[PDB]
Structure formats: structure tokens, C-alpha cells
Amino acid sequence: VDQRTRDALQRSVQLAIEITTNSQEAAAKHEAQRLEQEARGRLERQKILD
Amino acid sequence: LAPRNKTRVVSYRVPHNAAVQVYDYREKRARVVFGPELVSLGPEEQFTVLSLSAGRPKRPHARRALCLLLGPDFFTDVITIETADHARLQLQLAYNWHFEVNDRKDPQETAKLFSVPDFVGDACKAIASRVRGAVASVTFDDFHKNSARIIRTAVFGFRDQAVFPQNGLVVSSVDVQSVEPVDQRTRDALQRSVQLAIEITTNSQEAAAKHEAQRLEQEARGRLERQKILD
Amino acid sequence: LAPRNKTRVVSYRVPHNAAVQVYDYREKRARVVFGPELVSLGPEEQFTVLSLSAGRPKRPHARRALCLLLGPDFFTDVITIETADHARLQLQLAYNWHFEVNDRKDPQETAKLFSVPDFVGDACKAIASRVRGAVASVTFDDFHKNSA
Ligand SMILES: Nc1ncnc2c1ncn2[C@@H]1O[C@H](COP(=O)(O)OP(=O)(O)OC[C@H]2O[C@@H](O)[C@H](O)[C@@H]2O)[C@@H](O)[C@H]1O
Ligand SMILES: Nc1ncnc2c1ncn2[C@@H]1O[C@H](COP(=O)(O)OP(=O)(O)OC[C@H]2O[C@@H](O)[C@H](O)[C@@H]2O)[C@@H](O)[C@H]1O
Numbered sequence A: 001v002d003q004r005t006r007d008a009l010q011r012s013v014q015l016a017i018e019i020t021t022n023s024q025e026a027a028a029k030h031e032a033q034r035l036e037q038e039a040r041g042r043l044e045r046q047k048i049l050d
Numbered sequence B: 001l002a003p004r005n006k007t008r009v010v011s012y013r014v015p016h017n018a019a020v021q022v023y024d025y026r027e028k029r030a031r032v033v034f035g036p037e038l039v040s041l042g043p044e045e046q047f048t049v050l051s052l053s054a055g056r057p058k059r060p061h062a063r064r065a066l067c068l069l070l071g072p073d074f075f076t077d078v079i080t081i082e083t084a085d086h087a088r089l090q091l092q093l094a095y096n097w098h099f100e101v102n103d104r105k106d107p108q109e110t111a112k113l114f115s116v117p118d119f120v121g122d123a124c125k126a127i128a129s130r131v132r133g134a135v136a137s138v139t140f141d142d143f144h145k146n147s148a149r150i151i152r153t154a155v156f157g158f159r160d161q162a163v164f165p166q167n168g169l170v171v172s173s174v175d176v177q178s179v180e181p182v183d184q185r186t187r188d189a190l191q192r193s194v195q196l197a198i199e200i201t202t203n204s205q206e207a208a209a210k211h212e213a214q215r216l217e218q219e220a221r222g223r224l225e226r227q228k229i230l231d
Numbered sequence C: 001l002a003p004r005n006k007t008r009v010v011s012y013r014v015p016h017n018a019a020v021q022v023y024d025y026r027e028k029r030a031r032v033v034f035g036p037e038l039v040s041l042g043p044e045e046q047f048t049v050l051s052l053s054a055g056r057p058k059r060p061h062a063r064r065a066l067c068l069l070l071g072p073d074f075f076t077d078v079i080t081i082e083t084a085d086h087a088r089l090q091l092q093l094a095y096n097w098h099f100e101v102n103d104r105k106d107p108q109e110t111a112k113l114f115s116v117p118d119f120v121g122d123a124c125k126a127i128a129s130r131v132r133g134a135v136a137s138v139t140f141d142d143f144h145k146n147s148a
Helices: A003-049 B119-135 B140-145 B184-230 C119-135 C140-145
Strands: B011-013 B019-024 B029-034 B038-040 B045-047 B077-082 B088-093 B096-099 B169-171 C011-013 C019-024 C029-034 C038-040 C045-047 C077-082 C088-093
Touching: A003 B140, A003 B184, B077 B119, B088 B119, B119 B169, B184 C140, C077 C119, C088 C119
Parallel strands: none
Antiparallel strands: B011 B038, B019 B029, B019 B045, B077 B088, B096 B169, C011 C038, C019 C029, C019 C045, C077 C088
């Protein structure tokens, strides 16, 4: 009934879609860090071989 | 436009999938006929008018009509439901339906299709309550990713047929065509998400190109130092 | 332009891939005929008008028509779907379709093609729901790379 209760539930949407896109961004950052670490390890192994 | 003749027998041409039930009030015999046949009223036979539901938001009293189609049609209804994260969103279902008649010459089963007066409103609310009860228990991410299993195996959860034993109406698989949110704030935070998704996509592409360029530069540098040692 | 003669028998020239179902209301016999034949209505035979779907965004009531083509045609429909990264995008499908008739002289199977009144709207929504349900579960990169 209340527009205050219909606004706090709205604020909740954002806190839900905000933590959803934050989890997506954090998972993308962790995958990018893992790929960067793998590429860096391959680069240092190839530099030691060179 | 032209006024009808009151003397002539009232004849209604029933289509092959539609069905009309006539009440012969003189002998209190109710018969329902379907097929290519045009039904002819007697001295006191009267049609069964069905105040159905029509339109997009499914108004409860519209499309009044003598016939009742039993063929595989579909009615599209917008339903505004709320998820478990209090992000309300309006969505559409196709509602593929057909009346399943086991025997077409049975005075009781063929007249059972005219039990509920508004089968389009009843089949919309009975499938709107299920959708609202099944989506409000799951979050926005699980509903936006998997929007079809929890609306089809939930609307008619374990079987693929949503039978209605009041009138014999079955409902086939429901085909969603929009899961668009109501709020423009929710339609903007999902947009911001596009960029964070296309931004991390082009960042992964740029990082992979940079790592491949660094690997090729290191290989060329190692070949250059080996050739310089040989020189 | 010219007004038709109400006396003359209503004849409709059916094309080789189209199909018309006529309801002989006088004997309650429904027959559906296809081929090069022009069908002639009797004293009470009436055509099966199909309120189909037409246009790009596939409006549900347009192109009303007596015939029903069974040949390998295609309808193009724009569908606006959302990916798993909340990046909604509108896309088009060709929808190559044809009616598969196992036997062309069967009173039941040949009349089964006129069961759904709007086969173009039903075949668009049934294929739009599948596309929206299959693309919303996969991300933008996997959909833009492997879109087929
Ligand atoms: N006189 C009637 N008697 C029995 N059933 C009817 C009648 N009129 C409509 N119905 C059923 O109720 C449904 C109500 O549909 P609407 O909400 O009016 O139209 P919509 O839901 O936007 O789309 C339905 C679509 O399905 C096709 O059958 C039809 O060509 C239409 O485009 C119809 O699809 C039809 O199957
Ligand atoms: N009277 C009819 N009876 C039966 N089927 C029909 C009828 N009219 C159209 N159809 C089918 O429904 C489809 C609806 O098509 P539209 O949306 O009107 O046109 P579009 O989807 O833009 O393109 C279809 C294209 O396919 C070709 O068959 C046709 O030449 C057209 O260019 C048609 O392609 C046709 O196969």
C-alpha cells in the first residue's frame, strides 16, 4: 500500500542488480587476473628458455 | 446493418474447431454441437453466451461470444509479477491451449467445456498465480539467466500439460516473449550491466592481444639475442 | 472494383501449394482441397478464413485469407530478446517452414492443418519463446561469437 514500502523494495532491486553486476565484474576481473598470471608464467618460462 | 427477420429460424454457422451449446428449454435438453454444422434453434433453443476475457491486460468481461473454440489457439496476457529481490517486472506468456475432448458424443463431457463461464480469464489467473508464486521464490539473476525452466516446469511442474479438470482445458508449453522490467531504474541498471559486460569483453580482448604481443616480442627478442651471440 | 454477381457459384482458384478448407454446412461434411483445382462452393459451402499474422513485428490479426500455403515459404519476424548480461538486442529469423502432409486424401490429417487459426503467429511465438529462453542463459561474448 505505502509508497515508502514500494520504494524500499525498489532500492532493493538496485542492491540486487548492483551486487549481480558487481559479482559479474569481480568474476571477469578474477578470470582476467588468472589469464594474466598464466600468460606471465608462460612468458617467464619462455624467457628462461630464451 | 440490415434488420434480421424475426420469423426465420436463427441459424449460426459453427466453425470446425468452435463449439456452441444450445439449451432446448421446451424439453429441458441441453445439447452441444461442433463441426462444420450450422445449428438451427428450435422454438425455444437458446445459445450459451460466454462473457469471455480479451485484450492485453485481460479484462474480465469482453469478447462476449456464442461459440467456444477447442482448437490449439493461444492468448497473450501481460502479468506484472515481483521477484525475490523486490524488482517487479511485467512479462508475457503465449498460453498455448486446446480443449481435450475424450468423446465427442457424450452428453456430459462435451457439455463440461461450458462449465466455467470465462475460460480465458480462469486459465489466465490460474497460470498467473503459478507464475507469481514460482518467480517470487527465486532471485533476479536465476530468473534472468534461466527464464524458461522455472516458468514452464513450474507453471506445469512435475508433465508438459496444464490440465484443467473443470472444463477439460489443457495448456501446452508457454512461450515468453518479454521479461522487461517495469521500472526505468531496473531497466537502467541492467543497461549499465551491458557495458560492464561489453567493457570486460573488450578488456579481455585487449589483454589477450597484449599478452600475445608480449609473447611475440619476447620470442623475437630471444631470437635477436641468440643471433647477436652467434654474430 | 466491379460488383460480383450473387447468383454465380463462388469459385476460388487454389494455387498448387495453397490449401483451402470448405465447410459444406448442408451435410456437415468438411473437405479440404489443394492443387491446381478451383474449388466451387455449393449452396452452403463456406471458406475457412484464416486471420493470420503479417508484418515485421508480427501483429496478431492481419492478412486474413482463405488459402493456406503448404510450400516451403518463410516469414521474417523481429524479436527483441535479452542476453545474460542484461544487454537487450533485437534480431531477425528467417523461419523456413512447410506443412508436412503424410497423406493428401485423409479427411483428418489434411484437415489438421487448419487446427490453429493463426499458424504464423503461433509458429512465431513458439520459436520466439525458445530463442529468448536459450539466449538469456548465455553471455554476450558467447552469443556474438557463436550466434548460429
Ligand atoms: N468467440 C470466442 N470463442 C472462443 N474462444 C475465443 C473467442 N474469441 C477468442 N477466443 C480465444 O481467446 C483468446 C483471446 O485472445 P486475445 O487476447 O483476444 O488475443 P491475443 O491474446 O492478443 O492473441 C491471440 C491470438 O491467437 C490466435 O488464436 C488469434 O489469431 C490471436 O492473434 C483467443 O486467442 C482465442 O483462442
Ligand atoms: N494468404 C496466406 N495463406 C497462407 N499463408 C500465408 C498467406 N500469406 C502469407 N502467408 C505465409 O505467412 C508468411 C508471412 O510473411 P510476411 O511477414 O507477410 O512477409 P515477410 O515475413 O516479410 O517475408 C516473407 C517472404 O517469404 C515469401 O514467401 C514471400 O515472398 C515473402 O517475401 C508468408 O511468408 C507466407 O509464407
